[PDB]
Amino acid sequence: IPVIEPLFTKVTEDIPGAEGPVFDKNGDFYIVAPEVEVNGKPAGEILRIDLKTGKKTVICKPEVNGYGGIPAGCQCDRDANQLFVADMRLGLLVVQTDGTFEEIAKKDSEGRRMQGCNDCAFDYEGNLWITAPAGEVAPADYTRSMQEKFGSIYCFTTDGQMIQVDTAFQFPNGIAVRHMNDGRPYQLIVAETPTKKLWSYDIKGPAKIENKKVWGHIPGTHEGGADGMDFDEDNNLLVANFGSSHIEVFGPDGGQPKMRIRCPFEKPSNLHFKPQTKTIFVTEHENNAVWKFEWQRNGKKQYCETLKFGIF
Ligand SMILES: [Ca+2]
Ligand SMILES: [Ca+2]
């Protein structure tokens, strides 16, 4: 498999478990530090990064009734400049730029307790597809599906329903939605980290997924596997292969990667394109840092980049 070696430039450092890279509607850059701890207890943070200086600013340190969060993945909303954050302890949160947040759900549409979330992806219809590799949210004792298959998938809809769309995953992780050229969502990709698999479903509608299939195979027998992911403008899927020193590039049809991107570190965690550019910001857990490198083309527009009132 051809491997390219682009130049990685340092963005910022010392962010415990640097994850969920995201750009808001103003182009501000955010990162989550899920692994920050205070006396052995979770105390995860959401930070704003000044891209010019590398200076970090913690805007939110989520806690619900004393239970600190483990914010791990982000998506920026379209109709309002707010971040939807997958939290390993708190579930789904919505964080404002002023640093205030709200817990979206303690239970799903079926009255079942909410599970801790890791990453999420907004489709062009505004529905949020979330991976929930953790067990029940706080106050429940923290558990994660790295060994046992109790990881679930959710779809937080436009009409506010938190629907569990699938279950029994061994650590569902990165997630992305594939759209038709006209903008219609039709395929969901779910990373199952330890099994070195990328799963796909046909999106038949809001919170409606069918035909579960092993879509792609992640290289290596190392500990880790597919973590964060994102599509480029040509619908190639870039996946951070945690523990492999690479980011895998899958073609529109999946299967085996058609190219690999060597990172000057072994643990790429997540990635995100800077709107309107070929720049990919990459988080990694070896040095707990953020880097950026130039990909071959622009990234696929995120939900926050689309227009509610666009004519075209
Ligand atoms: Ca992740
Ligand atoms: Ca991303």
Q: Are residues 4 and 14 in contact, defined by beta-carbon separation less than 8 angstroms? A: no
- Residue 303's φ and ψ, nearest 5 degrees, are -50, -40
- 168 Cβ contact partners less than 8 Å away, ≥ 6 residues apart: 149, 150, 151, 152
246 is catalytic: no
Tell me the domain boundaries of the chain.
Answer: 1-312
- Identify the three-state secondary structure at position 303: helix
Taking the centre of ligand 1 as the mean of its atom positions, its distance from the CA of residue 73, in whole angstroms, is 6
b/e for 122-153, b at 16 or more Cβ within 10 A? bbbbbbbbbbbbbbbbbeeeeebbeeeebbbb
Q: Domain spanning 1-312 has what CATH number?
A: 2.120.10.30
Assigned token pair, 141: 């004792």
Nearest to 163 by CA among 220, 215, 232, 105: 105
Which ligand does the CA of 86 lie closest to?
1
Nearest to 186 by CA among 169, 168, 172, 206: 206
Resolution (A): 2.0
Nearest to 28 by CA among 7, 69, 61, 57: 57
CA distance 229 to 241: 9
Residue type, 285: H
CA distance 154 to 255: 24
Q: Are residues 138 and 110 in contact, defined by beta-carbon separation less than 8 angstroms? A: no
Taking the centre of ligand 2 as the mean of its atom positions, its distance from the CA of residue 65, in whole angstroms, is 29
CA distance 258 to 252: 10
Q: Are residues 282 and 274 in contact, defined by beta-carbon separation less than 8 angstroms? A: no
* Tokens 């000057």 -> residue: 264
Binding site, residues?
Answer: 19, 118, 173, 227, 230, 271-272
Between strands 67-68 and 172-179, the pairing is: unpaired
Q: Are residues 167 and 204 in contact, defined by beta-carbon separation less than 8 angstroms? A: no
Binding site for Ca(2+), residues?
Answer: 19, 118, 173, 227, 230, 271-272
Which ligand does the CA of 74 lie closest to?
2
CA distance 29 to 47: 8
